Symmetry: D2
Subunit: 58 residues, 4 copies
């Protein structure tokens, strides 16, 4: 599975979305061609807009 | 928007799924990395598993 | 199935939501305890917040 | 939040579904008029069909 870093804060707006905390690491489980990604953070799973994060370049 | 052709029949199992008629042409609007695609057929819009279809860009 | 009248305009904000036009009639197919309802209007199906509509009293 | 007890085992068939262990207690957070309920069990959150469970308010 694929890690990404939160560049911008995101407050979940629907119950199946994941709130993103600026500076944290999320695990991306799934990508959609429309730019919504599904991932996990701190025991929570859900959808977020991909342009709030940047995939880790290791 | 992209055409795909139905190889195997698929009965919608959830309310947001599209039933696929064998041999028919569907318009794929969206693709997700877990193999679910979203498309339309004869007025209807829904998700379906991509291993039941075959993409065209021929 | 159960008709309702749109009291307030709603512009769909996710792809599985239904835009509501002020004054139109929607068919409600499903209600959720959190207040999201699923219905159809003019060949479109999707979710909307129930407090934008009023169930028809006939 | 409301307890329900699992009568029949259920294997999650979609990524947003909850697997139900027979005999276990789940917390139902939400109910939809088509018979899908959303609940939690041992850290996990997901949808499941309500005819596999039995509500308590005893
Ligand atoms: Zn927004
Ligand atoms: Zn999408
Ligand atoms: Zn790194
Ligand atoms: Zn199936
Ligand atoms: Zn998926
Ligand atoms: Zn809103
Ligand atoms: Zn809900
Ligand atoms: Zn009337
Ligand atoms: Zn099933
Ligand atoms: Zn439903």
């Amino acid at each position: 599975x694929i890690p990404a870093f939160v560049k911008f804060a995101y407050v979940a707006e629907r119950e199946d979305e994941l709130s993103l905390v600026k500076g944290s690491r999320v695990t991306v489980m799934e990508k959609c061609s429309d730019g919504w990604w599904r991932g996990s953070y701190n025991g929570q799973i859900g959808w977020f807009p991909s342009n709030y994060v940047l995939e880790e370049v290791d």
